[PDB]
Amino acid sequence: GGPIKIIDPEKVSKEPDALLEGFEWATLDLTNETELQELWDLLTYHYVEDDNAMFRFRYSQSFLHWALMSPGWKKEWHVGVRATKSRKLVASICGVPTEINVRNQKLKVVEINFLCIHKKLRSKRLTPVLIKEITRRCYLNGIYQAIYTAGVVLPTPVSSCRYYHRPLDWLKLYEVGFSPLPAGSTKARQITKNHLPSTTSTPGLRPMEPKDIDTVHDLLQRYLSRFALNQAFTREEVDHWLVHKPETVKEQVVWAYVVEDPETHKITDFFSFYNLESTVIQNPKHDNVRAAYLYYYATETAFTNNMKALKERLLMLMNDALILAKKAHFDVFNALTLHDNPLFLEQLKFGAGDGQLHFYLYNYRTAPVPGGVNEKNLPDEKRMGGVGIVML
Numbered sequence: 135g136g137p138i139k140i141i142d143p144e145k146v147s148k149e150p151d152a153l154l155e156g157f158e159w160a161t162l163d164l165t166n167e168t169e170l171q172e173l174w175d176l177l178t179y180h181y182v183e184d185d186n187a188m189f190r191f192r193y194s195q196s197f198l199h200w201a202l203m204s205p206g207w208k209k210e211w212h213v214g215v216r217a218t219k220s221r222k223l224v225a226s227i228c229g230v231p232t233e234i235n236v237r238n239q240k241l242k243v244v245e246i247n248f249l250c251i252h253k254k255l256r257s258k259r260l261t262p263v264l265i266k267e268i269t270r271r272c273y274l275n276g277i278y279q280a281i282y283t284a285g286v287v288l289p290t291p292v293s294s295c296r297y298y299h300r301p302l303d304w305l306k307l308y309e310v311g312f313s314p315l316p317a318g319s320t321k322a323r324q325i326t327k328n329h330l331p332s333t334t335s336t337p338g339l340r341p342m343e344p345k346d347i348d349t350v351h352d353l354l355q356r357y358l359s360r361f362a363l364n365q366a367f368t369r370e371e372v373d374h375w376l377v378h379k380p381e382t383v384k385e386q387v388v389w390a391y392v393v394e395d396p397e398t399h400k401i402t403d404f405f406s407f408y409n410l411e412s413t414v415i416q417n418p419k420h421d422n423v424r425a426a427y428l429y430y431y432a433t434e435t436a437f438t439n440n441m442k443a444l445k446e447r448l449l450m451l452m453n454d455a456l457i458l459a460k461k462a463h464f465d466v467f468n469a470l471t472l473h474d475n476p477l478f479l480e481q482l483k484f485g486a487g488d489g490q491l492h493f494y495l496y497n498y499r500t501a502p503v504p505g506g507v508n509e510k511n512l513p514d515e516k517r518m519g520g521v522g523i524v525m526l
């Protein structure tokens with residue numbers, strides 16, 4: 135396990151490659167609100183859909199601000215293509231820097247995201263061109279490896295994880311065609327199945343505060359060390375990725391909650407989730423699915439390696455996260471089979487999803503890592519330990 139090739143810094147081109155006639159390269163400045171608007175305009179109509187063209191991801195402008203201007207960010211890695219005459223933004227590809235651990239080798243990488251071509255420009259082989267240009271921009275800045283996820287199979291996947299969905303407002307989900315009504319059942323019976331308590335159960339549960347950063351940083355790092363592939367968080371990354379700033383962010387995107395032990399007052403667990411809507415492409419009575427996605431978490435209980443005790447602790451914590459998300463008006467709680475999630479998905483009534491996320495490394499070779507599923511693509515507790523990075 136190691137890099138595939140060494141990039142010769144002396145030979146990185148200062149000029150980008152040629153584009154389709156009528157189009158030109160443009161760095162995006164997402165500090166300019168009109169440019170953030172442009173990116174949002176493009177993703178809102180042209181980003182990731184299911185196969186039935188029912189749903190499209192609808193990242194908010196707030197989410198994009200948050201996802202793309204994280205610690206160590208560079209505008210140079212926010213790449214646009216525009217039409218030369220009208221100036222219209224027609225494609226994008228983006229990165230932000232982070233460090234990852236790949237089987238206890240630490241690597242400086244770009245996370246690549248928000249690859250997007252306007253529907254009218256599809257099937258013209260612009261993707262490889264986008265990919266080559268961001269690669270060039272990264273090489274110039276001293277970064278030679280990447281990580282990304284996609285829902286399509288490409289060469290040499292590192293892992294593969296299945297999406298799971300816990301209805302919070304079952305009837306909303308049923309009405310937009312997201313959740314089916316099985317079959318021998320009724321609306322009343324699905325609502326009953328999905329009922330949650332009105333209050334949380336874990337003692338000392340409260341929202342995270344800025345004062346919690348150093349302890350959450352420590353516990354998260356220890357927790358994530360238990361996975362072959364994981365994100366190697368810095369303290370700035372804990373602040374950015376976990377601690378909502380209501381002063382400065384009007385439309386909250388991240389929620390995080392800690393458990394302050396009632397006896398010792400040390401934080402013993404935490405969990406977090408983020409706000410990511412999908413647009414309901416063509417439905418009478420609703421227009422959006424308001425999803426919360428489980429993000430990072432950690433529990434002291436993990437380090438006993440009592441798998442029994444770990445499941446019990448995660449059942450309570452995750453049910454609390456469901457309750458908190460319902461309380462914040464989310465329709466669905468979404469999670470993948472990564473981390474230790476196969477311990478709690480099926481019992482907390484998450485339904486298996488159609489979507490799958492495939493994980494890839496650029497210019498780094500490593501053995502595959504388990505992604506929390508077996509050969510039937512069902513959660514498996516003996517197939518965890520592999521993926522400990524959640525990309526947005």
Ligand SMILES: CCCCCCCCCCCCCC(=O)SCCNC(=O)CCNC(=O)[C@H](O)C(C)(C)COP(=O)(O)OP(=O)(O)OC[C@H]1O[C@@H](n2cnc3c(N)ncnc32)[C@H](O)[C@@H]1OP(=O)(O)O
Pocket residue numbers: 180181182183244246247248249250251252255256257258259260261262265268269272273277278279280281282283284285286288496
């Ligand atoms: C050191 C630093 C390096 C940094 C770079 C690391 C690599 C990063 C790589 C990317 C990380 C992205 C992470 C995310 O953001 S994943 C999300 C991607 N976005 C969407 O799904 C939004 C909706 N779709 C679109 O906007 C377009 O359909 C896209 C742009 C996806 C393809 O446009 P189009 O449909 O018009 O295709 P084409 O004719 O231009 O080109 C076809 C070629 O493109 C290859 N392809 C298709 N889909 C993907 C895909 N998701 N990852 C990598 N490659 C992909 C494809 O196999 C074919 O290759 P080949 O037939 O020649 O083999």
Ligand SMILES: Cc1ncccc1COc1c(Cl)cc(-c2ccnc(N3CCNCC3)c2)cc1Cl
Pocket residue numbers: 182183184185189190191283284285286297412423468487488489490491525526
């Ligand atoms: C509810 C919904 N909203 C928008 C699109 C698709 C769906 C249905 O369930 C999913 C979900 Cl939630 C996600 C995906 C998916 C698959 C592969 N890549 C992605 N993206 C690229 C990586 N970031 C997440 C978006 C999404 C695919 C499906 Cl089928």
